[PDB]
């Protein structure tokens, strides 16, 4: 059939010319049923038509077509645990989005994709349905109805074939959990394939670190209950016999550094095989080769196992590689943070030979900064250069501001409130400004802090702080006096050894003392300052302005920040009033904490804590009584009431402010007082020496599945505080408070773990060596006051 005209009907978006080009047939040619069929098939293959009804009139070839409807809107219903925006992004990534044509063939595909996503999440009964609503002008709206079920939670994790280690012990280190006590935080009971792979690898490492070279995981099974509300995980393993390490052999193109590597591959003949040690040796070899310029020093270990004598001979293959030089280091995604902020965290120098370890260290430092949600690296090659690369870092910035609130309770400070707003990255400059405030029974504190982490390119930081502090002594178990003080303080920080950190600075503090109960020590100090108050009223007042030079040194080596098992932390703090200040004194403090594990697993530890302090005046004056040292409580000597160790106040006779019988008053004239009098109110001392020896043991009764999250210890605390300026000769009848021989000792048991309410620490101690006036307090606890 000859065609004189080709016409189209129903076209909406596809151009007539484009469709005509698409058709094999063209106007002015013979045409047959086969040609009609081919044209229809091609038109449908275009992918923009739902039905094609190519037709022939008497002379004209009429074509009726129905284009795929355009999506007008997308709606969701029932996506309780999946956000609407998350569903929208998933769908556009799949391909379906507003404004495009609704392919009536992919409804099932989309539904199955969503169901697969839900199954990955953990909801195995989730059902997804799509409702399509036609609209005028060839428009269609799709509605996705969701039937999310109940998430499936692990009911048991079992290991079959383990004879040397209990299944609970093995699961203790797993990410997946089958028991979640309400009184502890260990994680959720959800299942994920990534978690399963991770904890399988963790089990493999656990077994390989004990010498089980032939360890093997036969297979793993994941099962569901018929209701699909629970998951059972089984792992079958074949643990072999323990193997010794006969020796280490190194071969390959070491690049003339053989002598230096044999020193890195030295072991005691007859040592238990250890995969962690093997990996450390490989990393050390890689670090050496990198230090000598090579960028990709591949290292492999292929142990040879001899079952006759149970010995392992390591075969290490080392290939130095080539040297690559970094031409540029680029940062992309730092819309807010400036370039220098990201660049100063780099251990890899631009224009120098490449190092994979250095690049990884830079990435880790960028992650530690905390300003970015994600950090990625890409070592792009330079076209036309076989040994030059460009390192590119892609960072997704994250919000840094944070409101904060906190509530805690304890025996010492009672109810503690905290509140503050922080900004770790001020306008992408690296400055960390913030205002904080705390309040407890005896003190309310509020400070405004500004710090520059990099005052010098090396890493020196310049601080800054304005603070206001109100201190109520009587609420702190001391002699009655109120001290409302405010001041400023700027300090520097010098990192010197990656563990040690010096710091020096200046400061100005104004102290306004009022509501002071007359007593020997306070009046001695006041006389030393030239004041001549009266020992008759509690309405005294006193103000001073002091400029101090504060210095300190902090050594930190603890392996872990929480429940450390090895290392030592030493902190030294100082202070001295520079001339021109009302006060003239120096103060020194020293805190120590040493952990000495006594087993390979680091489950039995010995903790030794000591605290020291001393201070005195310079120009014939006394150290301020509000700078004294206090001992006793849950932090210095457990079993004693907080701030109870040390000298006790000796009040003079004085009429009370507002006398009212039925209330205990301290040695007042209205009760028949005509001479000085001893009391039991702590005042502290200018010298302090506290020591503690604590033995840490595993929790005996808690299930071994999560017994590592609770720390049990038996302690023996010692302490003493004395006043070096006390004049024993004048006050002969009263106890001599200048004698340091009065050592207070206590012992007991303490518990400590993390709870949803916050960190918990409980302690029961029985002070078996106390002196007159000391108030004992056996049970002590602190819930969340560490925030």
């Amino acid at each position: 059939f000859v065609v004189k005209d080709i016409h189209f009907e129903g076209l909406q978006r596809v151009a007539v010319g484009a469709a005509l080009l698409s058709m094999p047939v063209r106007t002015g040619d013979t045409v047959n049923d086969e040609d009609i069929s081919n044209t229809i098939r091609a038109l449908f293959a275009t992918g923009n038509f739902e039905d094609v009804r190519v037709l022939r009139d008497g002379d004209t070839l009429l074509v009726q077509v129905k284009e795929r409807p355009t999506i007008a809107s997308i709606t969701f219903s029932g996506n309780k645990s999946v956000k609407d925006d998350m569903l929208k992004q998933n769908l556009e990534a799949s391909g379906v989005r507003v404004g495009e044509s609704l392919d009536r063939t992919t409804i099932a595909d989309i539904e199955k994709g969503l169901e697969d996503f839900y199954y990955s999440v953990g909801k195995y009964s989730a059902s997804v349905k799509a409702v399509v609503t036609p609209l005028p002008r060839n428009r269609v709206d799709l509605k996705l109805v969701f039937q999310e079920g109940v998430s499936a939670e692990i009911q048991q994790i079992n290991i079959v074939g383990n004879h040397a280690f209990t299944t609970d012990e093995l699961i203790s280190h797993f990410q997946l959990r089958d028991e979640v006590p309400w009184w502890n935080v260990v994680g959720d009971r959800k299942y994920q394939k990534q978690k399963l792979a991770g904890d399988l690898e963790t089990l493999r490492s656990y077994y390989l670190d004990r010498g089980y070279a032939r360890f093997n995981i036969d297979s793993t099974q994941v099962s569901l209950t018929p209701d699909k509300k629970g998951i059972y995980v089984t792992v079958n393993i074949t643990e072999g016999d323990q193997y010794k390490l006969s020796g280490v052999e190194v071969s390959g193109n070491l690049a003339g550094h053989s002598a230096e590597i044999e020193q890195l591959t030295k072991i005691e003949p007859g040592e238990l095989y250890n995969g962690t040690k093997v990996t450390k040796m490989e990393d050390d070899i890689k670090k050496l080769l990198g230090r000598y310029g090579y960028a990709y020093p591949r290292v492999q270990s292929m142990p040879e196992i001899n079952d006759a004598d149970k010995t392992v001979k390591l075969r290490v293959n080392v290939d130095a590689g080539n040297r690559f030089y970094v031409r540029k280091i680029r940062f992309e995604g730092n819309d807010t943070s400036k370039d220098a902020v990201l660049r100063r965290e780099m251990r890899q120098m631009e224009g120098a030979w490449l190092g994979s370890d250095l690049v990884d260290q830079g990435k880790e430092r960028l992650n530690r900064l905390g300003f970015f949600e994600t950090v990625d690296t890409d070592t792009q090659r330079v076209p036309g250069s076989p040994d030059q690369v460009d390192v590119v870092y892609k960072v997704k910035e994250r919000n840094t501001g944070s409101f904060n609130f906190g509530i805690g309770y304890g025996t010492e400070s009672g109810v503690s409130f905290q509140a503050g707003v922080q900004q770790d990255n001020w306008l992408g400059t690296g400055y960390a400004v913030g205002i904080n405030g705390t309040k407890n029974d005896y003190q309310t504190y509020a400070e405004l802090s500004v710090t520059n982490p990099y005052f010098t390119v090396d890493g020196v930081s310049l601080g800054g702080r304005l603070f206001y502090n109100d201190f109520q002594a009587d609420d702190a178990d001391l002699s009655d006096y109120t001290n409302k003080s405010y001041g400023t303080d700027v300090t520097l920080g010098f990192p010197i050894n990656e563990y040690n950190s010096l710091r020096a600075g200046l400061g100005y503090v104004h102290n306004s003392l009022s509501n002071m109960q007359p007593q020997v020590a306070m009046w001695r100090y006041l006389y030393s300052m030239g004041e001549h108050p009266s020992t008759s009223d509690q309405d005294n007042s006193f103000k001073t302005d002091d400029f101090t030079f504060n210095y300190g040194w902090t050594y930190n080596k603890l392996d872990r920040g929480y429940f450390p098992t090895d290392g030592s932390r030493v902190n030294l703090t100082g202070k001295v009033t520079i001339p021109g200040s009302d006060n003239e004194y120096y103060k020194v403090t020293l805190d120590t904490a040493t952990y000495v594990p006594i087993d390979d697993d680091h489950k039995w530890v010995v903790l030794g804590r000591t605290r020291w302090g001393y201070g005195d005046g310079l120009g014939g004056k006394e150290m301020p009584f509000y700078e004294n040292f206090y001992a006793g409580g849950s932090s210095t000597v457990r079993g004693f009431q907080s701030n109870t160790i040390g000298p006790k106040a000796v009040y003079f006779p004085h009429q009370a402010s507002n006398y009212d019988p039925d209330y205990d008053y301290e040695c007042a004239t209205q009760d028949g007082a005509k001479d000085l009098c001893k009391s039991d109110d702590a005042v502290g001392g200018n010298a302090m020496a506290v020591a503690s020896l604590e033995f840490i043991t595993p929790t005996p009764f808690i299930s071994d599945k999560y017994a590592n999250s609770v720390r049990t210890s038996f302690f023996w605390d010692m302490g003493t505080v004395w006043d070096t300026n006390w004049d024993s000769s004048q006050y002969s009848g009263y106890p001599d408070y200048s004698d340091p021989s009065n050592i207070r000792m206590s012992a007991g048991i303490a518990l400590q773990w993390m709870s949803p309410l916050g960190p918990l620490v409980f302690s029961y101690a029985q002070p078996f060596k106390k002196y007159d006036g000391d108030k004992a307090e056996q049970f002590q606890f602190n819930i969340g006051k560490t925030w």
């Binding site: 919000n399 944070s402 409101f403 904060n404 609130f405 707003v421």
Partner: peptide, 7 residues
Amino acid sequence: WNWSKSF
């Protein structure tokens, strides 16, 4: 307890 919300 300590709540921390990011602004």
